[PDB]
Amino acid sequence: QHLTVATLEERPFVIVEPADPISGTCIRDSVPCRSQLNKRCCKGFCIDILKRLAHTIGFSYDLYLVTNGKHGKKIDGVWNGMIGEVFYQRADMAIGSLTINEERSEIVDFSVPFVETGISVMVARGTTVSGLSDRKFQRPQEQYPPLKFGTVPNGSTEKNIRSNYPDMHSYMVRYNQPRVEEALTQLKAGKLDAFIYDAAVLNYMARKDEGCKLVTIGSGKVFATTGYGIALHKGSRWKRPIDLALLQFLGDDEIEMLERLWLSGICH
Ligand SMILES: CN[C@H](CC(=O)O)C(=O)O
Structure with missing residues (x-):
């Protein structure tokens, strides 16, 4: 019922900003996020996905920004980044612009892809x-x-x-x-x-x-062609509820709405 979630800034999927100096809180559509090293607030396409999963599935979460590398790289037998946080069970899940590939899929479970890339x-x-x-x-x-x-x-x-x-x-x-x-x-x-x-x-x-x-x-x-997916512990009991929710969001045109909201631009 309470999940620790690892993320990483990569606009416009994850955007990090200071708390509102006036209120000292995260206002607007932002949520509190701390640094792995330990204030800061996070928003964006992936954060809006996370908010909707939390509400639809019914979990609370603790969101943190990875400082041990970035998305995930394996060097000399050891993973860093968001993948490492999940693989070493420091986080229950990782979400952001995290690309599904064969190497990673071998060691963590991924949700169904929710962004084509x-x-x-x-x-x-x-x-x-x-x-x-x-x-x-x-x-x-x-x-x-x-x-x-x-x-x-x-x-x-x-x-x-x-x-x-x-x-x-x-x-x-x-x-x-x-x-x-x-x-x-x-x-x-x-x-x-x-x-x-x-x-x-x-x-x-x-x-x-x-x-x-x-x-x-x-x-x-x-x-x-591949996709962004949410990384979870290999064998995670969270994979199924998350997949069903994402699939539901897709069919309800909720993901398309988020694409329009976050990813639209002027140039063509
Ligand atoms: C947006 N994807 C990141 C960075 C990259 O693809 O090189 C990754 O999953 O590694």
């Missing part, structure tokens, strides 16, 4: 590349000044590229970005020619770009 590439509107099938990407060191392109490492995007396109991955390493905000800054400054990342996030960023100067190209057949 995958991998896409974002470029400046003028930049002449065809997409991720382009040799500028695929054979990066075959030309005069090489194309500069990178990702934010340590997550499902990098894992997918390393597994499927190890030569391209080795090239991208020097262009790793610390977060999406910095990657976008480098794209606009021409320090990167392309940014390869989660499709749901990139599409949102392109829809919100000032001047509509950034465009995304879907990866097509280069990478598979």
Whole structure:
């Protein structure tokens, strides 16, 4: 009846803000969230999902922001990030822009996916590349000044590229970005020619770009389609109620409403 939930900031799925200085509380559609290191309030698409699950299923929760890495990476036998919090049973569940992949699915249970995603590439509107099938990407060191392109490492995007396109991955390493905000800054400054990342996030960023100067190209057949899912302990008794609720939200057009509310933009 009381769940500990791990999350991670990734706008607009999870957005972190200070408490209202006037009231010292979380007002509007926000909820209290503390840091794993230990005030702060969280809102966004995934938080609205969490609020609805809590109400529909009938649990209370304690929400915290992960500081031990980000989404989840396995290094030398040990998981960090949201996946690690769930895998090591520090949290009952983790929710945010958490991408379902084979590696993670082996060790945690995932809810049914509630956001469709995958991998896409974002470029400046003028930049002449065809997409991720382009040799500028695929054979990066075959030309005069090489194309500069990178990702934010340590997550499902990098894992997918390393597994499927190890030569391209080795090239991208020097262009790793610390977060999406910095990657976008480098794209606009021409320090990167392309940014390869989660499709749901990139599409949102392109829809919100000032001047509509950034465009995304879907990866097509280069990478598979997947989804965000809620991570739970392997064998969790929470998987079924959560799945049924999510499936219900989908059919009630509640998820579509949340998409309109949180993910809509101006550019097309
Ligand atoms: C939005 N997904 C994150 C970051 C990434 O895909 O690289 C992840 O699940 O790892």
